[PDB]
C-alpha cells in the first residue's frame with residue numbers, strides 16, 4: 001500500500017496473507033472456515049495462510065496450510081482478466097473476534113463510492129519496503145468510461161478501478177488478492193496497476209467481486 005497508514009486494530013478480521021513458507025506472497029480474504037478468496041496471479045503449488053493478526057509474522061497468529069487452489073476458468077496469465085482464485089484450507093480456520101468471514105456483496109457499488117483497500121504489500125516503489133502492520137488507504141471507485149481513458153485495451157469488463165485524483169495512494173506488489181471494501185461489503189480484490197507504483201492518476205485495478213458471486217458460491221459448493 002502506497003501513501004497509506006496502519007489499518008485500525010482489529011478492523012480487518014477477514015484479511016489473510018498467503019505466504020510462501022513464511023514469506024509474504026499475496027493478500028487474501030476469508031470467505032468461510034475452509035476458503036480464502038484471492039487473486040489468480042497469486043497461484044502457487046501450496047500456501048501457508050496467516051490469519052488473526054494485523055501484524056504479519058505475529059508469532060501468535062493462526063497459520064494454516066493450503067494445498068488446493070482454483071483459479072476462475074476465464075483467468076488469463078496474459079491480460080489478468082478474471083483475476084480471482086479460491087484457496088481451500090487443509091483444516092478449518094478458527095473463527096473469533098479477530099478471524100471473521102468477509103461480507104460478500106449482493107450489488108455493485110457505484111462510481112465515486114469511497115472505499116478502503118488494505119495489505120502488507122510494499123509501501124515504496126520501485127525500492128521495496130515491507131511493513132509489519134497491515135496498511136490501509138481510502139480510494140474512490142472510478143467509472144469504466146473514465147478508467148478506459150487511462151488503460152484503454154488493458155481494461156476488461158469485470159475489472160474495477162479506484163484511486164484518488166493526483167494522488168499516490170494505491171496498492172502495490174504484495175497487496176494482490178487483498179480486500180477493497182466499500183460501505184460494508186467486499187467490492188474488489190487487488191489485481192494490478194502501473195509500475196512503479198503510486199503514479200498519480202494511474203488507478204489501481206481490482207477484480208470486481210459483484211460480478212463473481214455466482215462462481216464463488218458454486219465453486220465452494222463443488223469442492224463440497
Ligand SMILES: *C[C@@](*)(O)[C@H](Cc1ccccc1)NC(=O)[C@@H]1CCCN1C(=O)[C@H](C)NC(=O)[C@H](C)NC(=O)CCC(=O)O
Pocket residue numbers: 025026039041042080154171172173174175176177190191192193194195196197204
Ligand atoms: C500480484 C499482486 O500482488 C500485484 C499487486 C500490484 C498492484 C498494483 C501495482 C503493482 C502490483 N499485481 C501484479 O503484480 C499484476 C499481475 C502481475 C503484473 N501486475 C502488475 O500490476 C504489473 C506490474 N503492471 C503492469 O504490467 C502495467 C500494466 N504496466 C506498467 O505499469 C508499465 C507501463 C506504464 O508504466 O504505463
